Amino acid sequence: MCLKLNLLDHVFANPFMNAAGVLCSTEEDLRCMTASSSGALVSKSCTSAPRDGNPEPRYMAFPLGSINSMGLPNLGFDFYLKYASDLHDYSKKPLFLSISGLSVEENVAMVRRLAPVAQEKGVLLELNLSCPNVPGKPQVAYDFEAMRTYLQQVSLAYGLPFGVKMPPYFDIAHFDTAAAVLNEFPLVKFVTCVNSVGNGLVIDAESESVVIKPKQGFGGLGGKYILPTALANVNAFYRRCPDKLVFGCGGVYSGEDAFLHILAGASMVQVGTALQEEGPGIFTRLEDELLEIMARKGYRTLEEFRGRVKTIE
Amino acid sequence: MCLKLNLLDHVFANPFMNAAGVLCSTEEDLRCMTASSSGALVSKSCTSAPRDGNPEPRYMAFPLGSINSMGLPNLGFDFYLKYASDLHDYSKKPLFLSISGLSVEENVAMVRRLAPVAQEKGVLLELNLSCPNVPGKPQVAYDFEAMRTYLQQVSLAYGLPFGVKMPPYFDIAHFDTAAAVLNEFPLVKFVTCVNSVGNGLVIDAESESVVIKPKQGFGGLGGKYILPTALANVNAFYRRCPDKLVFGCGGVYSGEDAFLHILAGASMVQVGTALQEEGPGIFTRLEDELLEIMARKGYRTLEEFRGRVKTIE
Ligand SMILES: Cc1cc2nc3c(=O)[nH]c(=O)nc-3n(C[C@H](O)[C@H](O)[C@H](O)COP(=O)(O)O)c2cc1C
Ligand SMILES: Cc1cc2nc3c(=O)[nH]c(=O)nc-3n(C[C@H](O)[C@H](O)[C@H](O)COP(=O)(O)O)c2cc1C
Ligand SMILES: O=C(NCCO)c1ccc2cc(CCc3c(C(=O)O)[nH]c(=O)[nH]c3=O)ccc2c1
Ligand SMILES: O=C(NCCO)c1ccc2cc(CCc3c(C(=O)O)[nH]c(=O)[nH]c3=O)ccc2c1
């Protein structure tokens, strides 16, 4: 009875990892994720230049989830590239590096420089597409032209297996369209569903105030709020992309949640808010709980139930 | 101290009503909603001919919310028109009538016929824009040209103040765009934010099965999942539509949830899932709890804090 998996030519002790953005910004964070019993880790989404990000407060959490508008604070590509090439310990677990350049040219620049480290060290690329392009255009993934563009250019510049981080979708035509676009690109080997549910508003009743400072308090939502959304999107893409892997992200707090993500078709399972709230010790709980569910049901491997959600009739 | 209000030339005992879809399909349903404490009622979205809708099970609810894919079952427009014409007791409360035709033609044909009853009785039209189109093109609200067409055609045929039911948006550019369209139409006096959060999927861990039979288990989400989403949209439309009323829908289980909807800008507050779950008694509780918050803060009127949510700095 085990949680092991081989995929994209790497071996993983278990399906669990942090979500990009959570506990992965500094050397200190990365070293902690690495010492944890997560199956893998992903670095904070970076830009070329170091960024300070938005004014604080900019993240907040509550019993049923979180809201954030961090504005992409990170130490700069050079920092994460050096961490990938010089400091990370691959014998402990695989590394993902998430890039989130503010234009297609910034993304091409970084990936060209990432390629040789990817080849030499085996670091994996997660391209963040649930990012802004020009203001007053939808973020990149809600704009299938822009998305096609970024993917051709990044496939050309990088020329290696990478994966993509998707915002959630809510309409069948969008699922149909976005999957068709993704299927045009043999090198997109994996799809992460989903990024935060965009522009929610949390209001505090005692103070009659929004709880984060940027954007008049509008920010991305994570946690329990988003589980059924995360599952629909995992399962939509798992059904429409028979040749790609789906990574589930969204509202995982328990093994049962991880179990549901996996029945929906998830290969890896990421943890954002719950990790932020609970700290890296969460990873041992998640594993035990999922293993308990598997034992009770007679499952021995993840592949026995992955994608095996049943419909009625 | 009390909660009465005046809008669109009708008096309301309080700002609560059912959401379209819930306890509003048969004559028995509507008679019950009328005998409740709700300030108003809306009828089930209707089509010209009666519909059986989707295979059961087609609705399910859980502690954090609900999922449905009813498929628009209804007794047909003749029935709801006759209810609006001859059966409804307007001395008890205002009535809204929701129409949700499958094409613009079906919708224009309904409204020409409803126009004279509206004149004569004062029934109000809620145009459901959050419906199929589910052929090959996105649904109407997520397709701004189709949205402009239905609005032009309908305001032509109806020629009276009416309102539109909106699905949620998740992007600043879409709020800017959707809002600009609605502002093209002086006859649209109210915007209801929001309809169910489209296409989530609820999987049950024990039986490893989806919970509803149509659309392979995919359906609209209501309840506690959607509250911060319902509040971002109320407030995004509140700020961008200064000449329109905003009606909040989504995630109301308490006086507090209603309070936050109003702080966000809502004038009427709609209850769906919580009503389906607790029954019409919910209105007396919500009234009380909302009056209780007001008293503790020394607010006398909804007008005092409607829309007056604070941002930081
Ligand atoms: C503080 C914070 C920072 C985040 N940063 C990123 C990021 O840099 N890149 C990214 O792709 N997603 C980011 N996310 C979204 C998470 O990666 C994840 O997609 C989302 O929070 C849903 O997961 P959860 O439900 O487990 O929180 C961030 C989320 C939070 C709460
Ligand atoms: C069983 C069911 C039927 C519904 N039918 C309709 C409908 O016919 N027309 C409509 O505009 N919305 C319909 N809705 C959406 C609700 O009006 C409301 O927008 C949504 O449930 C979110 O509100 P809540 O969080 O209070 O449930 C329905 C919802 C449910 C649960
Ligand atoms: O300028 C911004 N925000 C306020 C001004 O409009 C801004 C800039 C870059 C951003 C970049 C992202 C992508 C990184 C990211 C963030 C994040 O760092 O804010 N939060 C998420 O939940 N998901 C994400 O993918 C999200 C929001 C951003 C907002
Ligand atoms: O046949 C349908 N679905 C199965 C796949 O085509 C179908 C047909 C008409 C529909 C019409 C609507 C509009 C009514 C509605 C419903 C509803 O009655 O299903 N549920 C909601 O949460 N919000 C709504 O606005 C919603 C879903 C529909 C699905």
Query: What's the gap in Å between B131 CA and the centre of ligand 4?
Result: 6
Whole-number CA gyration radius for chain B? 18
Tokens, residue B264 = 């966000």
Position B227, amino acid: L
CA distances from residue A162 to A234, B138, B209 in whole angstroms, order as listed: 18, 29, 32
Residue B93 near residue B38, CB atoms below 8 Å:
yes
Q: Would you give the distance in Å from CA A43 to the centre of its chain?
A: 10
Cis peptide before B50 (omega within 30 of 0): no
Any residues with CB less than 8 A from the CB of A213 and at least 6 apart, and which? Answer: A54, A55, A56, A57, A58, B311, B312, B313
Q: Which atom of ligand 1 is nearest to the CA of A273?
A: 27
Say if residue A165 carries a ligand binding annotation: yes
- For residue A230, what is the nearest residue in chain B, using CA coordinates? B200
- For residue B9, count CB atoms less than 10 angstroms from its CB and return exposed for 0-12, middle for 13-18, buried for 19 or more: exposed
User: What pairing do the DSSP bridges indicate for beta strands B188-193 and B162-166?
Assistant: parallel
B200–A225 CB contact, under 8 Å:
no
Cis peptide before B133 (omega within 30 of 0): yes
Question: Which among A252, A201, A306 has a CA at the least distance from the CA of B234?
Answer: A201
CB atoms near residue A20 (< 10 Å)? 25
Of A136, A173, A199, the CB nearest to B136: A173
Residue A270 near residue A252, CB atoms below 8 Å:
yes
Q: Which CATH architecture group holds A54-71+197-222?
A: Roll (2.30)
Residue B24 near residue B43, CB atoms below 8 Å:
yes
Q: What H or E segment, with its residue span, contains residue A180?
A: helix A172-183
Count the alpha carbons within 13 Å of B111 in the hemisphere toward its beta carbon: 28
Interatomic CA distance for residues A40 and B100, integer angstroms: 48
Residue B204 near residue B67, CB atoms below 8 Å:
no
3-state secondary structure of A157: helix
Interatomic CA distance for residues B67 and B229, integer angstroms: 16
B201–A235 CB contact, under 8 Å:
yes
Ligand nearest to the CA of B99: 2
Any residues with CB less than 8 A from the CB of A43 and at least 6 apart, and which? Answer: A20, A24, A30, A80, A83, A84, A95, A96, A97, A98
Calculate helix-pair angle for B255-264, B227-240, nearest 10 degrees: 30
Query: What's the gap in Å between B4 CA and the centre of ligand 1?
Result: 43
Q: What is the DSSP letter of A43?
A: P
Any residues with CB less than 8 A from the CB of A245 and at least 6 apart, and which? Answer: A7, A8, A163, A189, A190, A191, A267, A268
SS (H, E, C) A118-150: HHHHCCEEEEECCCCCCCCCCCHHHCHHHHHHH
Residue A94 near residue A124, CB atoms below 8 Å:
yes
Interatomic CA distance for residues B222 and A142, integer angstroms: 23
Identify the residue whose tokens are 């093994």.
A255
Q: Would you give the distance in Å from CA B179 to the centre of its chain?
A: 17
Residue A19 near residue A42, CB atoms below 8 Å:
yes
Q: Is B131 annotated in the active site?
A: yes
Whole-number CA gyration radius for chain A? 18
Residue A203 near residue B263, CB atoms below 8 Å:
yes
SS (H, E, C) chain B: CCCCEEECCEEECCCEEECCCCCCCCHHHHHHHHHCCCCCEECCCECCCCECCCCCCCEEEECCEEEECCCCCECCHHHHHHHHHHHCCCCCCCEEEEECCCCHHHHHHHHHHHHHHHHHHCCEEEEECCCCCCCCCCCHHHCHHHHHHHHHHHHHHHCCCEEEEECCCCCHHHHHHHHHHHHCCCCEEEEEECCCEEEEECEECCCCEECCCHHHHEEEEEEHHHHHHHHHHHHHHHHHCCCCEEEEECCCCCHHHHHHHHHHCEEEEEECHHHHHHCCCHHHHHHHHHHHHHHHHCCCCHHHHCCCCECCC
Question: Which among B169, B163, B162 has a CA at the least distance from the CA of B142?
Answer: B169
Q: Which residues of B183-221 are buried (b: 16+ CB within 10 A; e: fewer)?
A: eebeebbbbbbbbbbbbbbbbbeeeeebbbbbbbbbbbb
Q: Which residues are bridge partners to B127 per DSSP?
A: B99, B164
CB atoms near residue A1 (< 10 Å)? 8
Q: Whose CA is nearest to atom 4 of ligand 2?
A: B21
Tokens, residue B242 = 């200064």
Q: Whose CA is nearest to atom 6 of ligand 3?
A: A215
Interatomic CA distance for residues B108 and B121, integer angstroms: 20
- For residue B134, count CB atoms less than 10 angstroms from its CB and return exposed for 0-12, middle for 13-18, buried for 19 or more: middle
CB atoms near residue B86 (< 10 Å)? 9
After which residues is the backbone of chain A broken at C–N > 2.5 Å? none
Position B215, amino acid: K
Q: Where in chain A is the domain with CATH 2.30.26.10?
A: 54-71+197-222
CA dihedral (A290, A291, A297, A300) positive or negative: positive
Tokens, residue B150 = 């239905």
Interatomic CA distance for residues A168 and A90, integer angstroms: 31
Position B152, amino acid: Q
Give the phi and the psi of residue B77 in degrees, each rounded to 5: -60, -35
CB atoms near residue B270 (< 10 Å)? 29
Q: Where in chain B is the domain with CATH 3.20.20.70?
A: 1-53+72-196+223-313
Question: Which among A297, A290, A240 has a CA at the least distance from the CA of A268?
Answer: A290
Tokens, residue B91 = 């001395």
Of A171, A205, A212, the CB nearest to B139: A171
Give the phi and the psi of residue B35 in degrees, each rounded to 5: -70, -15
Interatomic CA distance for residues B8 and B122, integer angstroms: 10
Q: Which stretches of chain A are assigned E, i.e. beta strand?
A: 5-7, 10-12, 16-18, 41-42, 59-62, 65-68, 95-99, 124-128, 162-166, 188-193, 197-201, 203-204, 209-210, 218-222, 245-249, 266-271
Question: Which among B228, B70, B64, B166 has a CA at the least distance from the CA of A228?
Answer: B64
Of A67, A174, A311, the CB nearest to B210: A311
Q: Would you give the distance in Å from CA B233 to the centre of its chain?
A: 13
Interatomic CA distance for residues A20 and A42, integer angstroms: 6
Question: Which among B242, B263, B274, B312 has a CA at the least distance from the CA of B22?
Answer: B274
Interatomic CA distance for residues A92 and A86, integer angstroms: 14
CATH class entry, domain B1-53+72-196+223-313: alpha beta
Q: Both ends of chain B: CA-CA distance in Å?
A: 33
Residue B300 near residue B1, CB atoms below 8 Å:
yes
Interatomic CA distance for residues A229 and A175, integer angstroms: 13
CA angle A63, A68, A71 (to 5 degrees): 165
